[PDB]
Design an enzyme around this catalytic site. Structure first.
Site, short mmCIF file in Angstrom:
data_model
loop_
_atom_site.label_atom_id
_atom_site.label_comp_id
_atom_site.label_asym_id
_atom_site.label_seq_id
_atom_site.Cartn_x
_atom_site.Cartn_y
_atom_site.Cartn_z
N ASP A 75 -0.50 -1.71 -6.51
CA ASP A 75 -0.54 -1.00 -5.23
C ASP A 75 -1.86 -1.32 -4.50
OD1 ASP A 75 -0.35 1.36 -3.34
OD2 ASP A 75 1.36 1.92 -4.60
N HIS A 77 -2.84 4.94 -0.31
CA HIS A 77 -1.47 4.99 -0.86
C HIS A 77 -1.51 4.86 -2.39
CE1 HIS A 77 2.44 3.04 -1.84
NE2 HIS A 77 2.90 3.82 -0.88
N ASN A 117 12.58 2.34 2.44
CA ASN A 117 12.80 3.40 3.41
C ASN A 117 13.58 2.92 4.62
OD1 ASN A 117 11.08 4.99 1.74
ND2 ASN A 117 9.28 4.50 3.02
N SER A 126 8.11 5.44 -1.93
CA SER A 126 6.86 5.25 -2.68
C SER A 126 6.45 6.46 -3.53
CB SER A 126 5.72 5.13 -1.71
OG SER A 126 5.57 3.80 -1.27
#
Ligand SMILES: [Ca+2]
Ligand code: NA
Lengths: 281, 63
Positions: free
Chosen positions: A32, A64, A155, A221
């Site tokens: 990430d 994130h 998404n 996520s």
């Protein structure tokens, strides 16, 4: 005082914690944007950066990766939130820069680092609409090597009858995770398609943010690290179970929700997954 | 309006102008097409994926 975010309760992680299992000795790579290792509610065991211009994996210039990491493994203490697998050995594998993007080669290099460093679980809260042969080979290699590989489904919402699951989620070797809210309803943004495997909480998920903060994020996520954390709880209770067995335990014990195109097999239930005998509730 | 398929193949500059007319508080980030990105959902954000000529190469959408 510590708070337990609703999604940790929703997947039944407290039942494993009460049995005494919290992910101890399980190595989870969060592939990430980095992880803020200075956060008092996180313990980062190691890591590496594949981002040429951001060489420190323990600095998260986006936020994130720190949020995802807290859902996997925020510490069990008297502060902040509680992670799914609060004793997991957490590794910051930075493959995304500050702007939230990375090149395919950076992601593959991080998967290869995870394999070389004997990670038990990889979480990839990331995706793109196209695959590549090299990306597919890296995830297939990690799975052949025994790693449980979990990724966000994406998404992209719905698009008639078309799959909208992104890569690497869309590869059969990767567990693709969609998002539901606290009522078990699919989030409007959650990707759909026959590659959607399971769902987990992905709406208004409280977790750790850089500079000793907390906040609620939304996304597949956020759903993915509930499943990566659940895999670490399962492996801490059954340390000899293979990735094949961990994956099947999670798939075979979901709470079935709607049609599988929209919900996959339903919501994960880590209490049921970590029993020897598996069925849906 | 949450998706702009009519912007595919336009310059990044026109896309920004159009999106900001429809969603003036949009947080627009320009990224290379063919990268992998974080899978969080941000209602205020519109990512614009461009090709090497700086034209829009994927349908812009909120998120
Ligand atoms: Ca805590
Ligand atoms: Na998959």
């Amino acid at each position: 005082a510590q708070s337990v975010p609703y999604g940790v309760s929703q997947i039944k992680a407290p039942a494993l914690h009460s049995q005494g299992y919290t992910g101890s000795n399980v190595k989870v790579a969060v592939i990430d944007s980095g992880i803020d290792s200075s956060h008092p509610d996180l313990k980062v065991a190691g890591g590496a950066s594949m981002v040429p211009s951001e060489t420190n994996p323990f600095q998260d210039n986006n936020s994130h990766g720190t949020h995802v990491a807290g859902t996997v493994a925020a510490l069990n203490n008297s502060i902040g939130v509680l992670g799914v697998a609060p004793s997991a050995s957490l590794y910051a594998v930075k493959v995304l820069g500050a702007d939230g993007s990375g090149q395919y080669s950076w992601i593959i290099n991080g998967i290869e680092w995870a394999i070389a460093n004997n990670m038990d679980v990889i979480n990839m809260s990331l995706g793109g609409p196209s695959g590549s042969a090299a990306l597919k080979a890296a995830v297939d290699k990690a799975v052949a090597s025994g790693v449980v590989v979990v990724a966000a489904a994406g998404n992209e919402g719905t698009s008639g009858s078309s799959s909208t699951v992104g890569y690497p989620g869309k590869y059969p070797s990767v567990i693709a995770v969609g998002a539901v809210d606290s009522s078990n309803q699919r989030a409007s943004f959650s990707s759909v398609g026959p590659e959607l495997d399971v769902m987990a909480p992905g709406v208004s998920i409280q977790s750790t943010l850089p500079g000793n903060k907390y906040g609620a994020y939304n996304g597949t996520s956020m759903a993915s690290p509930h499943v990566a954390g659940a895999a670490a709880l399962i492996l801490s209770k059954h340390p000899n179970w293979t990735n094949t067995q961990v994956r099947s335990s999670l798939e075979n014990t979901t709470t079935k929700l709607g049609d599988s195109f929209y919900y996959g097999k339903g919501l994960i239930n880590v209490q049921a997954a970590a029993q020897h005998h598996h069925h849906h509730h | 309006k949450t998706e702009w398929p009519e912007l595919v193949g336009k310059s990044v500059e026109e896309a920004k102008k159009v999106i900001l007319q429809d969603k003036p508080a949009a947080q627009i980030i320009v990224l290379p097409v063919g990268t992998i990105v974080t899978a969080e959902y941000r209602i205020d954000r519109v990512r614009l994926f461009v090709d090497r000529l700086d034209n829009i190469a994927q349908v812009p959408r909120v998120g």
